[model samples]
Target chain A: MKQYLELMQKVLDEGTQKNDRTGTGTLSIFGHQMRFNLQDGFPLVTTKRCHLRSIIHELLWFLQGDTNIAYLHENNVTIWDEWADENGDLGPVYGKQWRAWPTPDGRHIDQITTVLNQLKNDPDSRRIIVSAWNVGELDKMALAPCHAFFQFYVADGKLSCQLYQRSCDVFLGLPFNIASYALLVHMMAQQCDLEVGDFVWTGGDTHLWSNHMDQTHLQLSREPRPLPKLIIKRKPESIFDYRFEDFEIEGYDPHPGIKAPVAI
Target chain B: MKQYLELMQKVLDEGTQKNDRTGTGTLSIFGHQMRFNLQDGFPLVTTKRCHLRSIIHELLWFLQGDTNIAYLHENNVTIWDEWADENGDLGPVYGKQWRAWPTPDGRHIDQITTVLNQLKNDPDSRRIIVSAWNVGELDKMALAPCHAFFQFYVADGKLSCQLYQRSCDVFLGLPFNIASYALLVHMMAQQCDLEVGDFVWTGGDTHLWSNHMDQTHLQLSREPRPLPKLIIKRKPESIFDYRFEDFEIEGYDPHPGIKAPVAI
Candidate 1:
């Protein structure tokens, strides 16, 4: 995960200070890109111990197209607790947009299924993409998507995914963002019977919150351990049919977790 | 620009061979990024002479929210000629999406105006983005957007723009894409009373068309000249008020034009 550390160092060395909506200022850089080859291993941040349980549940919830936090709570995932309303709804967020984007013409577009079909039938097509930045629906979302857009490409019988994240909380949010998408790529590849290729992460307004500097340095001090191999116990019938029990991480020994305050 | 040349060279050296929608195969690489400092000069491809007339008119038309090719025809710019219907309409492309994205509830959101307001009032906001990839409306368009999404960032009183182009025709379309976004950054900065920062371009499936390989090498063999400076002759009342005549490109000397067939 030197790429992860290198991005941190770059931000610390060259990042510009800017005020943000959260009231916690940030040391921000406008554009950055990183690539993780999934064939190497699952790109869990080994510098510090990360709980993959929450990430797995969050991804599954997203796949289920559930906007409310009910599913998350059932799985003990508190990541969406801060954003949910009294009714447990988070409005039309990532899951809603990803699984079923509402159209102006009284229709909904299932982007995930569409992309999956394209990957299965027209793997060479460059238009295979899924975007969560629904323009008309932003005001309705509890939070605008940070990992806003993504594209998939197939080459030499391998599937690669690229995410265009509009804003990144480099210290707190980015690690989970990387793992979630990497996991998504693995599932997508498995469903299509293709080998895993790469997960390319691109960011706009990438930053470490001012409050996270101490945690950032602490994690940076530790050398990245060897990446853990992810084992999908079994392939389900489809992309959405997998359970959290299906995933197992092997050889994920790492340094202790470094705690940082969330900007929100 | 050296950055531009380096991208083409990188694609030549490392791009994967892939079949494409146009049936003209491409040597493609999935993720690539380049940065041009707007303060330096306009980032026109000086290795090969490029006509900026069409790009300027197209941008003006996009800002006006005009999806019909008639406006382009009026300006004698036929770049969009191939995609128009008998009535010259291109259903809900860049122009309509940028200017007025429709909602399920029958409201139309002017993304350009919203972004302009964000730039003016909340310059530090990370969510200042314009997306042309309306998933729900993709089926209605003549062609999907290639330069699909973009975001604006402001730091140190200067505005910067980053474009996420899903597919790039490196030899033919890239030069125009770069110049168009750079021009947009300049105009946006002028409108908001900010200095131009950088234009960071990120591509998903960046490629050189198989047929254009000869032209790519021909252009790549030539030495690159200094970039030209863009002059916005006047500040229009609003972003929507700019005219084609209100722009000039000074000191853009280069080799003769390299013609290649459009992949359509």
Candidate 2:
């Protein structure tokens, strides 16, 4: 959490001003890194209350490899409503890339299943990677992936995951991004029968939008409370089997959620 | 270059002992980032006198979108010979992925030309990314890309680039990776008519092989000198038009080259 705040402060202090695609200008730094040790506790943002329900459902949707927003809408997750087409399809977005990346020769590569097999069978493999930034498929995606690529490493019976995000909106998108990936690391560790290690987040073009300055200061004013504990009520048979009911957050008393406008 | 040495030192002290695919044990750590400001000078490793000739030609070959080692061989650069087949083809690797990634419908996307256009047309775009991690084609690759994905950012008339490397061989490969990407940032900046910014390198599963421990120590013991300067003798009409003879490295004095075995 300190690392998260430090990133915000660093951007505010030394970031260069830049115009952006969304028409909302930004103060951005090109690169930054943050690490969250899962063994300590869940990495839900403490300065502002965050809804884990949407994060959970979104991850579940990704695991299912469903590109359409129908599932998310069914679960009351409206985070992607603006990006979906009239058919509710995101046009082979994260889920498609993760679970069924189409090949030129009429075959699909299941990156998620591949990573699962690698984690279970050859935990020491350096190539345990899942990339959503499919070069040939970018034009079709509703939104190009910001959390573009990620890698997993296992050592001392602990599973660690690192995410490389090509773009980040620090105030609005990044907290959710961190929590979602941390949750993914936790679930993956459980499936691999290993202790959770760390969630390392690396970013390129990390920025706080011009409109979020007030909310950013409001968030910076509060001190981070003790991290909340994540309780997975049941271990599903596999990585993709978990239901939303399986997750529970305990002792998540935090300051009120700060409101910030989405750049889009 | 202190950042380079610091990374090696960090791996030596804090890295976990892990068995690797090469059967050479490694002291490894997952998730590390280093930044080099390109305006300061070129970021060649001062402790080791690296030959920029091979790096330069390899880049030119990649930009040419040629995936064969014949071009490299013609230039007397044997760095890629170990992985080439009898036909001298490397399947679809960096060159192909960078310049002409194939889609499912049989259309080839020219990513380099696209990026050059984006840099010129929409310098503020956050989606300025290039990736070589084509999951569907991984099996066909002679070697999976280690420096997998990279992104570019423009702010205040300077272009900054960030590279995400899925795996790193600290003793032998890292210095080359750094210099290559720095060179790329410089070229891209020059092409975009912007000042050079930072070259931010992020790594997953960074390691030092057990056999290279002595060389690592030798490198760590030496005092680093000032960074060298990279002077592009001429600006080629386009990014793809650069030649090896068009580049020169000045003031690259160093102790000597420390030889280490390649991991492959």
Candidate 3:
């Protein structure tokens, strides 16, 4: 968590002020990275209370290849409500690109399936990447992917993943991004019978909105607590078989939750 | 160049030993990042002398949307020779993806043109990205993109770029990758009427092939010289109009070049 804190401080100390699309000015920095070793503990941001419910459902929905917001609504998650259209459809977002990236020749490439096969059969292959930055489909997505691309690496029977996020709202989105990807790594490792390794998060145009400056300072003033351990109740039959009930967090003591405005 | 040296040393001391597709073993690390500020000097590796001629030609060829080795051959650069088929074609590689990415709707998207437009028109936008890891076109490429995707950032009258590389051969490939993107950043800044900023490089599956161990050690022993300055003598009318002869490197003194075996 020190890594996360240091990043926040760095942005405050040295980030350049810039105007953004939402007209919400931001203190922004470009090109940052942080790594969390899963063996130590789940890398939850312990300085502030972050609920894992919405993140879990969102990931599951993505793994299920559901682009519509109906599944999220069924699971009582409204994180994406702002982006969904009248039909509850988000068009070709992360789920669609991850599961069925459309090709020019009318074939849909299942990036997740390909990565899974590569992880299971050829772990050392450097090309085990899943990209959601579908160039042709950007105009159609309700929101272009922020956590746009990720790659998996295996060594000594340990599976590690790195995520490339193009834009980050540090106060609101980054914590969720880190936890979600870390959880994904755990799920993937379990499915492949590999030990968990590190979750490395890389960001471009990482920023703290001007409105969230007070919240950012408050969180930064607090000390990071001991990292909580993630307990998966049982090994799922496959990645898609896991549910909300399967995850449990132990020994998470943190400061009270801090509220911040979403940039959108 | 200390950042570059530090990464090499980190890989040597702490990298996990793994078997790779090349069957040559690697001392590999999953994720790493390095930042080079362009205002200081060009970030060509100072420990060893590197040739910029081939790289310049290759970039110009990519800008031309030429996937064949003919242009490179005409420039007397053999870097892409190993990947070309009998007909000197390397398939839909970086060049094709950069200049004319095929879309599902029977259209071609020029990512470089779009980035140029974004840089000049909306410099504050965070969506300015160029990706070569086209899921639909991977099978057609002779080699999957190593320096897969990159993004541009503009702030305070300075332009910066970040490259996300999927795999790297540290001893041989990394220096080339860094200089190429840095060169691109310089050119982009010139075209957009801005000063050069940082060239941030991020890598996944960064490794030094086992065979390059001796060469790596040799490089680390040498003191890093002052970085050279890249002098783009003339600003081309467009991103594609630049020629190799227009570029020059001044003050690139270094130790003798150390050779390493290519993993391929």
Per lDDT, the best of the predicted structures is 1
Scanning candidate 3 chain A in windows of ten residues, the lowest lDDT window is A255-264
State the displacement of the C-alpha of residue A239, model 3, in Å, after optimal TM-score superposition. Answer: 0.7
Model 3: residue B157 alpha-carbon error in angstroms? 0.9
Candidates arranged by lDDT, highest first? 1, 3, 2
Which is superior by DockQ, 1 or 2? 1
On TM-score, the stronger of 1 and 3 is 1
Off by over 4 Å in 2: none
TM values, all candidates: 0.99, 0.98, 0.98
lDDT of 1 by residue, B119-156 (tens): 99999999999999999899999999999999999999
Pull out the clashing pairs in model 2. Answer: none
lDDT of 2 by residue, A1-264 (tens): 788899999999989898877888999888999899998999988999888889999999999999999998898899999888999999989999999999999999999999999999999898999999887888899899999899999989999999998889998899889999998988998988999999999989889999999999999999999999999998889999999999999989888998877866
- For residue B122, model 1's alpha carbon misses the true position, in angstroms, by 0.8
DockQ of each: 0.91, 0.88, 0.88
iRMSD (Å) of candidate 3? 0.7
Clashes of each: 0, 0, 0
Interface RMSD of each: 0.7, 0.9, 0.7
lDDT at B236 for candidate 2?
Answer: 89
Q: Write the per-residue lDDT of candidate 2 for residues B1-264, one digit (tens) a residue.
A: 699899999999999998878787999999999999998889999998887888888888889989999999898999988889999999999999999899989999888888989999999899888889888899999899999999998888998899999889998888889999988888988888999989999999999999999999999999999988999999989998888888888888887999888877
